[PDB]
Amino acid sequence: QGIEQISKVYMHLPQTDNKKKIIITEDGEFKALQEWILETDGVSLMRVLSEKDVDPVRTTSNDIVEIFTVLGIEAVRKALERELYHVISFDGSYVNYRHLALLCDTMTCRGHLMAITRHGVNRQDTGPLMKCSFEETVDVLMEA
Amino acid sequence: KSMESVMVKYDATVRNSINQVVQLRYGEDGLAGESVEFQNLATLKPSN
Amino acid sequence: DDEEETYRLWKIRKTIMQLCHDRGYLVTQDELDQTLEEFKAQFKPSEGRPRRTDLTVLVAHNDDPTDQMFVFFPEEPKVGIKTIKVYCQRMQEENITRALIVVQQGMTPSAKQSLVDMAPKYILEQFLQQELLINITEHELVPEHVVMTKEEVTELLARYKLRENQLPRIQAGDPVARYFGIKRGQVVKIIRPSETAGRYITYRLVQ
Amino acid sequence: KRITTPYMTKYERARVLGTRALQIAMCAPVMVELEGETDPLLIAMKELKARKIPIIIRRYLPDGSYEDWGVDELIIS
Amino acid sequence: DREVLRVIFPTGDSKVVLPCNLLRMIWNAQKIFHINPRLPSDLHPIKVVEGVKELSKKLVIVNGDDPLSRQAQENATLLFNIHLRSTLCSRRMAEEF
Amino acid sequence: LQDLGVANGEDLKETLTNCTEPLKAIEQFQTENGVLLPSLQSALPFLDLHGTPRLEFHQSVFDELRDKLLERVSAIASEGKAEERYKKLEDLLEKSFSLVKMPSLQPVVMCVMKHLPKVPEKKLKLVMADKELYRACAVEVKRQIWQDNQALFGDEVSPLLKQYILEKESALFSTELSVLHNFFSPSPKTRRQGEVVQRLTRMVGKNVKLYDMVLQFLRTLFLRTRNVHYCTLRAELLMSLHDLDVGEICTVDPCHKFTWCLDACIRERFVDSKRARELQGFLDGVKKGQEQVLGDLSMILCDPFAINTLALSTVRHLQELVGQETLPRDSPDLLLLLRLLALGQGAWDMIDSQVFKEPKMEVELITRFLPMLMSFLVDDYTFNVDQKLPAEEKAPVSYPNTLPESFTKFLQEQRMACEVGLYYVLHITKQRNKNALLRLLPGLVETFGDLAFGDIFLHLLTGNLALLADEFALEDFCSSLFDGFFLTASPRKENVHRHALRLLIHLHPRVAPSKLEALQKALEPTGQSGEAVKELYSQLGEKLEQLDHR
């Protein structure tokens, strides 16, 4: 039984409000509910989302290319923003959101995951001299 | 080097060297990061 | 398993009704709200009512009553060219250009090539059975997507003095792009909440 | 039929002051009455407050067009 | 506006980042003009409503009059306009400030 | 009041006057004319002890319990049996019809009537005869009256139709010259949000009889006034009804499925082959003994935007067929377009006398006129390819600007050839080729039914002249437009004079003042024309004044 690639599932209740289930009561008040959430060690998101009695709204992943192949480029933009915010604000350090938004928009501007590494950025269309100044000067120059 | 040339153009849009729109307004609001500051929305939390 | 197969097919049909409604096609309200018990009552879940031929639906567009679409569920695990031509003869009989084919697990590479071949005269889209078990647009990460009309795109480019090359892009094989059936040259208006402006409306050109 | 902001940007202020200070340093005629002023930059800032600098800023929009703004027309922020 | 904020902030976090610190400016106004909060005030509520409307017009991120640019303008300053109307509502002006 | 034996001010008068005893009389009145309940009979002296008038109490409880009247009739609207509903509504109706004369109790009667689909005839009559009642009554009573009273339904449609024709005249003659905006710019939905069609749909509700009365009104209006606009309104009303999902009218009108294309076909302003096949099937479905709908269909096809759709589809068909080496005869789609256009153009002939036979086409249209259009176009593209090919020596030959006159004969003897040639002229103006333009500009002067001089082509030509805004720099071109073509029908037709005058309004800065004054003097109103041309002349004089200062 089970779904392949998922070798360990930990079950726990959240102690942070961001993971708690915030609902709006009948009086318009925010109530945070303790709900069981399962954190895995593998990734197969389409199968888990299809699975019975799994909330296919808030169920997410920390793997970006899974979100891309499963959900789409805009879901990738949001999830990437959320992961960058998480890793930055883990140590209580605040960065203005517009910088994160600009980075995630730049990466996802071309409708596909454009990695900051030389492959993604030099793959993307820029001037020859700019790609030269990046890295990989000679081969860029030879192709140009 | 990924975000070298991304600039706020004179039509208030954020574009790269290729003149491709990255954001229609900077930070989705067009506001610089210095003058903004933390505040509270008074009507969010209170009951009906 | 005979037990869960009607549940699976019911959720697939629910996703397809939600899709066709989002594509503008006329879907009756109860079809979008059909329960599993209602689904079973509508027709044994296997060998008495699995019939992937019978589940095939025909829907009509609300902007044109003759613009119609077929959803076809083939009964084989891998669909071959002869099934593609069977559905082509079906379309020619009803004169419906656009069609949708579900796929149980996989599709023959030759059948991909035939799908690419008959694209201009007949727009048929394939979809894995696994993908349709959830409507991805309900996911919190997926923002609101709208397909713009041509006059809207021209007004947009005229307002911002833009060329379509300068817009952000979206691949035509994107799950949301496939969900809406958009093709290259279409423009998608994406509406999403923003923590600094409230709402943000961006645009993406299909590629 | 102008769409750019009516406010002089920080970079516009910087370049205008530098250019006008260079002009004043090159014995250009001064467009404001000055008293005990020798540094070109102070005279340029006095002209800027006076809105008497004789410069037009050409702002290029990202479509190959432009708008020409007299410096007196812009709001000195 | 409250319902809109409930949509935008489902977590119920009131902490937000905005250009103009409205409470501090109100306090600055109170101290500049020596506003005694123990006495009735001479500010008409309808003046508050009309003034906040004209101010909302005066704050422009996207300039234009076609539906596209107007919608973009209303979306760009949606959150700040919600905060402005909530903060400078006539009730709080007549009671708190 | 006295209908139900209730004492009124007349009773108070006869009990007050000729009475040496006012005091016991008013006392017994105020006691026996109070509120019927024992708690109040204890509380009324106490209530009144504070100087509190009984007025405030009476008014407040009257308003509250009258709101309860409105709420309870709204609730019983769809509660339980219809028999119980309509029985209680009829009872309260007869009770408060005594009090319908009053200003405070008439809304009770009207709310009851609003919840009644059909009503006793005497109440309907008294609602009609008393103008205060009818002006105070909602349309629920009025639909029922109109179902047996065609006169007032005509009276109500008449001002709406009058303002519709006034707005149509203003839009067809609105002074602004632009390829972008014109009379044919707005979408079908934008033209269907007009108050007239929405009010008429409300006034018809879901009754076929009122629809048939609207139909006969539209027939009379389009025929006796010879104005196609009513036809468009008919189609709008029908498509508006389809938006309301009134199956009582969608499933009875056979031209409703025709309106499926015609709306989808006007919003594109082009008939694709699929919707062409749809229209073919609809025409083939017309059986014998029900061919009157063909007249309706011709009326439905007499819409100006439908004419624009069909003409542009034919013009673009012939434009694209040249690359395929296909003649107009070699295009069954184009034959179907010509069939439908012929059936549409004779629509007023089908209303004037009930003609349910198809009008016939011209052979020389297929073999001479349209092949002459295609003659001019393929020579056009030939000299274009030659210009794009190098090595042209000194003194190159111009494009042949001679005109075959059988072409112009078909323009001036065949309304279909006339209008398709007009839309061809507009299309090449959008292409703005001066050579072919001045080649065919002669012969357009004499054309069939003054269609070259009608509102449609003149408005569209003036809209397309924005693309030719700078082309007025040549006095020869300006004379070709003005002295050649426009001014022939200016002094004899009002619309032509107005269209030339508004052309001068827009193009005054892009011509030398000598020619501007020449065209101004040539466009003097004839001494009997409408206010439009003289107002445009005053604007011309003002503009000529303003040009000398720039």
mmCIF file of N, CA and C in Angstrom, chain C residues 75-153:
data_model
loop_
_atom_site.group_PDB
_atom_site.id
_atom_site.type_symbol
_atom_site.label_atom_id
_atom_site.label_comp_id
_atom_site.label_asym_id
_atom_site.label_seq_id
_atom_site.Cartn_x
_atom_site.Cartn_y
_atom_site.Cartn_z
ATOM 1 N N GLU C 75 -12.102 3.248 -23.433
ATOM 2 C CA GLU C 75 -12.164 2.117 -22.514
ATOM 3 C C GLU C 75 -10.883 1.291 -22.484
ATOM 4 N N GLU C 76 -9.824 1.679 -23.291
ATOM 5 C CA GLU C 76 -8.567 0.949 -23.325
ATOM 6 C C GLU C 76 -7.516 1.678 -22.496
ATOM 7 N N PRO C 77 -6.510 0.983 -21.952
ATOM 8 C CA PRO C 77 -5.523 1.706 -21.136
ATOM 9 C C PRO C 77 -4.607 2.580 -21.975
ATOM 10 N N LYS C 78 -4.209 2.110 -23.159
ATOM 11 C CA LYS C 78 -3.502 2.907 -24.156
ATOM 12 C C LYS C 78 -4.356 3.013 -25.412
ATOM 13 N N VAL C 79 -4.600 4.242 -25.856
ATOM 14 C CA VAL C 79 -5.510 4.513 -26.967
ATOM 15 C C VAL C 79 -4.712 4.514 -28.270
ATOM 16 N N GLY C 80 -5.234 3.811 -29.280
ATOM 17 C CA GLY C 80 -4.580 3.651 -30.559
ATOM 18 C C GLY C 80 -5.229 4.497 -31.646
ATOM 19 N N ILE C 81 -4.593 4.480 -32.827
ATOM 20 C CA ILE C 81 -5.022 5.322 -33.948
ATOM 21 C C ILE C 81 -6.454 5.006 -34.352
ATOM 22 N N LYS C 82 -6.846 3.734 -34.278
ATOM 23 C CA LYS C 82 -8.190 3.360 -34.704
ATOM 24 C C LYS C 82 -9.245 3.997 -33.811
ATOM 25 N N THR C 83 -8.967 4.119 -32.515
ATOM 26 C CA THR C 83 -9.880 4.843 -31.637
ATOM 27 C C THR C 83 -9.926 6.329 -31.989
ATOM 28 N N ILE C 84 -8.771 6.912 -32.337
ATOM 29 C CA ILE C 84 -8.733 8.315 -32.751
ATOM 30 C C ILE C 84 -9.607 8.516 -33.980
ATOM 31 N N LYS C 85 -9.523 7.598 -34.941
ATOM 32 C CA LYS C 85 -10.327 7.726 -36.150
ATOM 33 C C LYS C 85 -11.795 7.414 -35.881
ATOM 34 N N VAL C 86 -12.088 6.544 -34.910
ATOM 35 C CA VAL C 86 -13.471 6.326 -34.493
ATOM 36 C C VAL C 86 -14.070 7.627 -33.977
ATOM 37 N N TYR C 87 -13.334 8.323 -33.110
ATOM 38 C CA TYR C 87 -13.822 9.605 -32.613
ATOM 39 C C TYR C 87 -13.861 10.654 -33.719
ATOM 40 N N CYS C 88 -12.959 10.568 -34.699
ATOM 41 C CA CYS C 88 -13.024 11.480 -35.839
ATOM 42 C C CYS C 88 -14.293 11.262 -36.655
ATOM 43 N N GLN C 89 -14.654 10.002 -36.908
ATOM 44 C CA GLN C 89 -15.894 9.722 -37.627
ATOM 45 C C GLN C 89 -17.105 10.153 -36.811
ATOM 46 N N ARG C 90 -17.045 9.984 -35.488
ATOM 47 C CA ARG C 90 -18.101 10.492 -34.615
ATOM 48 C C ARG C 90 -18.260 12.002 -34.779
ATOM 49 N N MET C 91 -17.142 12.729 -34.733
ATOM 50 C CA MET C 91 -17.177 14.179 -34.894
ATOM 51 C C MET C 91 -17.724 14.572 -36.259
ATOM 52 N N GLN C 92 -17.286 13.882 -37.315
ATOM 53 C CA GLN C 92 -17.799 14.159 -38.654
ATOM 54 C C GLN C 92 -19.295 13.893 -38.735
ATOM 55 N N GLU C 93 -19.774 12.875 -38.019
ATOM 56 C CA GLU C 93 -21.204 12.595 -37.997
ATOM 57 C C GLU C 93 -21.973 13.735 -37.343
ATOM 58 N N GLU C 94 -21.502 14.210 -36.185
ATOM 59 C CA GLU C 94 -22.122 15.353 -35.518
ATOM 60 C C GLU C 94 -21.521 16.699 -35.929
ATOM 61 N N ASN C 95 -20.477 16.715 -36.766
ATOM 62 C CA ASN C 95 -19.875 17.955 -37.278
ATOM 63 C C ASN C 95 -19.398 18.867 -36.149
ATOM 64 N N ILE C 96 -18.759 18.273 -35.144
ATOM 65 C CA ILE C 96 -18.242 18.987 -33.980
ATOM 66 C C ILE C 96 -16.726 18.973 -34.093
ATOM 67 N N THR C 97 -16.134 20.156 -34.268
ATOM 68 C CA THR C 97 -14.704 20.219 -34.544
ATOM 69 C C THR C 97 -13.880 19.938 -33.294
ATOM 70 N N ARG C 98 -14.286 20.500 -32.160
ATOM 71 C CA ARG C 98 -13.502 20.451 -30.935
ATOM 72 C C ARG C 98 -13.887 19.228 -30.112
ATOM 73 N N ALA C 99 -12.883 18.562 -29.534
ATOM 74 C CA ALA C 99 -13.125 17.369 -28.734
ATOM 75 C C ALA C 99 -12.102 17.245 -27.611
ATOM 76 N N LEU C 100 -12.485 16.454 -26.613
ATOM 77 C CA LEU C 100 -11.675 16.202 -25.433
ATOM 78 C C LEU C 100 -11.641 14.699 -25.212
ATOM 79 N N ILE C 101 -10.444 14.161 -25.004
ATOM 80 C CA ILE C 101 -10.221 12.735 -24.812
ATOM 81 C C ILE C 101 -9.548 12.569 -23.461
ATOM 82 N N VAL C 102 -10.160 11.774 -22.593
ATOM 83 C CA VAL C 102 -9.482 11.330 -21.386
ATOM 84 C C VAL C 102 -8.582 10.149 -21.741
ATOM 85 N N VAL C 103 -7.622 9.871 -20.869
ATOM 86 C CA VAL C 103 -6.623 8.833 -21.083
ATOM 87 C C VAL C 103 -6.463 8.082 -19.772
ATOM 88 N N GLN C 104 -6.626 6.760 -19.818
ATOM 89 C CA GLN C 104 -6.642 5.975 -18.586
ATOM 90 C C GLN C 104 -5.282 5.974 -17.903
ATOM 91 N N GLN C 105 -4.234 5.589 -18.638
ATOM 92 C CA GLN C 105 -2.862 5.661 -18.130
ATOM 93 C C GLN C 105 -1.893 6.263 -19.124
ATOM 94 N N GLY C 106 -2.147 6.150 -20.422
ATOM 95 C CA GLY C 106 -1.170 6.542 -21.418
ATOM 96 C C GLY C 106 -1.802 6.509 -22.786
ATOM 97 N N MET C 107 -1.022 6.969 -23.737
ATOM 98 C CA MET C 107 -1.453 7.273 -25.082
ATOM 99 C C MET C 107 -0.343 6.891 -26.058
ATOM 100 N N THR C 108 -0.722 6.332 -27.208
ATOM 101 C CA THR C 108 0.282 5.848 -28.149
ATOM 102 C C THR C 108 1.024 7.024 -28.800
ATOM 103 N N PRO C 109 2.372 6.977 -28.901
ATOM 104 C CA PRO C 109 3.088 8.123 -29.511
ATOM 105 C C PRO C 109 2.645 8.437 -30.931
ATOM 106 N N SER C 110 2.319 7.406 -31.707
ATOM 107 C CA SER C 110 1.702 7.636 -33.004
ATOM 108 C C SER C 110 0.390 8.392 -32.858
ATOM 109 N N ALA C 111 -0.381 8.093 -31.812
ATOM 110 C CA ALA C 111 -1.641 8.799 -31.629
ATOM 111 C C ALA C 111 -1.411 10.258 -31.237
ATOM 112 N N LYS C 112 -0.319 10.562 -30.514
ATOM 113 C CA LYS C 112 0.070 11.965 -30.344
ATOM 114 C C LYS C 112 0.300 12.604 -31.697
ATOM 115 N N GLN C 113 1.060 11.926 -32.563
ATOM 116 C CA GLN C 113 1.403 12.535 -33.844
ATOM 117 C C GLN C 113 0.156 12.768 -34.687
ATOM 118 N N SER C 114 -0.792 11.829 -34.662
ATOM 119 C CA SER C 114 -2.045 12.039 -35.387
ATOM 120 C C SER C 114 -2.833 13.199 -34.789
ATOM 121 N N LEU C 115 -2.854 13.303 -33.453
ATOM 122 C CA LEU C 115 -3.500 14.443 -32.804
ATOM 123 C C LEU C 115 -2.893 15.758 -33.272
ATOM 124 N N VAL C 116 -1.568 15.797 -33.417
ATOM 125 C CA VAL C 116 -0.918 17.003 -33.930
ATOM 126 C C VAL C 116 -1.290 17.222 -35.394
ATOM 127 N N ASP C 117 -1.423 16.138 -36.166
ATOM 128 C CA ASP C 117 -1.709 16.267 -37.594
ATOM 129 C C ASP C 117 -3.067 16.915 -37.839
ATOM 130 N N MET C 118 -4.128 16.387 -37.217
ATOM 131 C CA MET C 118 -5.479 16.878 -37.538
ATOM 132 C C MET C 118 -5.870 18.130 -36.726
ATOM 133 N N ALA C 119 -4.900 18.835 -36.128
ATOM 134 C CA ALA C 119 -5.197 19.984 -35.270
ATOM 135 C C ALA C 119 -5.979 21.109 -35.948
ATOM 136 N N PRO C 120 -5.630 21.589 -37.153
ATOM 137 C CA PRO C 120 -6.380 22.740 -37.693
ATOM 138 C C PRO C 120 -7.828 22.418 -38.016
ATOM 139 N N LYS C 121 -8.076 21.284 -38.667
ATOM 140 C CA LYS C 121 -9.443 20.884 -38.985
ATOM 141 C C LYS C 121 -10.196 20.372 -37.762
ATOM 142 N N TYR C 122 -9.488 19.844 -36.762
ATOM 143 C CA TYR C 122 -10.115 19.221 -35.597
ATOM 144 C C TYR C 122 -9.220 19.399 -34.380
ATOM 145 N N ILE C 123 -9.715 20.119 -33.378
ATOM 146 C CA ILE C 123 -8.948 20.444 -32.179
ATOM 147 C C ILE C 123 -9.330 19.418 -31.117
ATOM 148 N N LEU C 124 -8.516 18.373 -30.972
ATOM 149 C CA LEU C 124 -8.714 17.340 -29.962
ATOM 150 C C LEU C 124 -7.611 17.449 -28.920
ATOM 151 N N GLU C 125 -7.992 17.454 -27.639
ATOM 152 C CA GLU C 125 -7.031 17.535 -26.535
ATOM 153 C C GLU C 125 -7.085 16.277 -25.680
ATOM 154 N N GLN C 126 -5.911 15.714 -25.385
ATOM 155 C CA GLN C 126 -5.781 14.548 -24.520
ATOM 156 C C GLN C 126 -5.507 14.977 -23.082
ATOM 157 N N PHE C 127 -5.984 14.165 -22.137
ATOM 158 C CA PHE C 127 -5.844 14.460 -20.713
ATOM 159 C C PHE C 127 -5.726 13.171 -19.918
ATOM 160 N N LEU C 128 -4.671 13.048 -19.114
ATOM 161 C CA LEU C 128 -4.510 11.862 -18.279
ATOM 162 C C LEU C 128 -5.649 11.748 -17.272
ATOM 163 N N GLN C 129 -6.097 10.508 -17.037
ATOM 164 C CA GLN C 129 -7.119 10.252 -16.024
ATOM 165 C C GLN C 129 -6.661 10.714 -14.650
ATOM 166 N N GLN C 130 -5.365 10.584 -14.365
ATOM 167 C CA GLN C 130 -4.835 10.972 -13.065
ATOM 168 C C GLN C 130 -4.972 12.474 -12.833
ATOM 169 N N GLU C 131 -4.766 13.278 -13.880
ATOM 170 C CA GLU C 131 -4.783 14.729 -13.722
ATOM 171 C C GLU C 131 -6.166 15.242 -13.339
ATOM 172 N N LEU C 132 -7.218 14.673 -13.922
ATOM 173 C CA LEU C 132 -8.571 15.183 -13.722
ATOM 174 C C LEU C 132 -9.191 14.768 -12.395
ATOM 175 N N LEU C 133 -8.486 14.006 -11.559
ATOM 176 C CA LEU C 133 -9.036 13.645 -10.260
ATOM 177 C C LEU C 133 -9.162 14.835 -9.319
ATOM 178 N N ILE C 134 -8.516 15.962 -9.621
ATOM 179 C CA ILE C 134 -8.738 17.213 -8.910
ATOM 180 C C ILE C 134 -8.829 18.345 -9.922
ATOM 181 N N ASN C 135 -9.631 19.351 -9.586
ATOM 182 C CA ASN C 135 -9.694 20.593 -10.349
ATOM 183 C C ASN C 135 -8.612 21.500 -9.773
ATOM 184 N N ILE C 136 -7.518 21.669 -10.520
ATOM 185 C CA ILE C 136 -6.358 22.390 -10.004
ATOM 186 C C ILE C 136 -6.660 23.860 -9.737
ATOM 187 N N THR C 137 -7.664 24.430 -10.410
ATOM 188 C CA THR C 137 -7.996 25.835 -10.193
ATOM 189 C C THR C 137 -8.506 26.101 -8.782
ATOM 190 N N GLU C 138 -9.017 25.079 -8.090
ATOM 191 C CA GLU C 138 -9.440 25.251 -6.705
ATOM 192 C C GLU C 138 -8.261 25.379 -5.749
ATOM 193 N N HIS C 139 -7.053 25.017 -6.181
ATOM 194 C CA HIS C 139 -5.896 25.061 -5.299
ATOM 195 C C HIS C 139 -5.586 26.501 -4.909
ATOM 196 N N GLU C 140 -5.137 26.686 -3.662
ATOM 197 C CA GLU C 140 -4.921 28.033 -3.142
ATOM 198 C C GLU C 140 -3.834 28.768 -3.916
ATOM 199 N N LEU C 141 -2.812 28.045 -4.373
ATOM 200 C CA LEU C 141 -1.708 28.678 -5.084
ATOM 201 C C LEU C 141 -2.152 29.197 -6.444
ATOM 202 N N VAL C 142 -3.052 28.481 -7.114
ATOM 203 C CA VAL C 142 -3.490 28.857 -8.454
ATOM 204 C C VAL C 142 -4.309 30.141 -8.333
ATOM 205 N N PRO C 143 -3.910 31.270 -8.925
ATOM 206 C CA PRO C 143 -4.756 32.466 -8.872
ATOM 207 C C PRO C 143 -5.885 32.364 -9.894
ATOM 208 N N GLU C 144 -6.712 33.405 -9.940
ATOM 209 C CA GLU C 144 -7.813 33.428 -10.893
ATOM 210 C C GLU C 144 -7.267 33.667 -12.294
ATOM 211 N N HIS C 145 -7.679 32.825 -13.240
ATOM 212 C CA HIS C 145 -7.309 32.942 -14.645
ATOM 213 C C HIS C 145 -8.543 33.286 -15.467
ATOM 214 N N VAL C 146 -8.372 34.191 -16.430
ATOM 215 C CA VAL C 146 -9.424 34.564 -17.370
ATOM 216 C C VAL C 146 -8.800 34.611 -18.757
ATOM 217 N N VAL C 147 -9.509 34.089 -19.751
ATOM 218 C CA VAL C 147 -9.058 34.153 -21.138
ATOM 219 C C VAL C 147 -9.583 35.452 -21.743
ATOM 220 N N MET C 148 -8.671 36.313 -22.190
ATOM 221 C CA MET C 148 -9.061 37.568 -22.818
ATOM 222 C C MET C 148 -9.482 37.355 -24.267
ATOM 223 N N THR C 149 -10.411 38.194 -24.710
ATOM 224 C CA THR C 149 -10.832 38.270 -26.100
ATOM 225 C C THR C 149 -9.879 39.176 -26.879
ATOM 226 N N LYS C 150 -9.932 39.060 -28.211
ATOM 227 C CA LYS C 150 -8.960 39.749 -29.062
ATOM 228 C C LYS C 150 -9.040 41.266 -28.916
ATOM 229 N N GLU C 151 -10.250 41.823 -28.947
ATOM 230 C CA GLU C 151 -10.416 43.263 -28.752
ATOM 231 C C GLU C 151 -9.886 43.704 -27.391
ATOM 232 N N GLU C 152 -10.044 42.870 -26.362
ATOM 233 C CA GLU C 152 -9.463 43.202 -25.063
ATOM 234 C C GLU C 152 -7.939 43.240 -25.132
ATOM 235 N N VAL C 153 -7.331 42.307 -25.872
ATOM 236 C CA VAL C 153 -5.873 42.300 -25.995
ATOM 237 C C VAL C 153 -5.397 43.546 -26.732
#
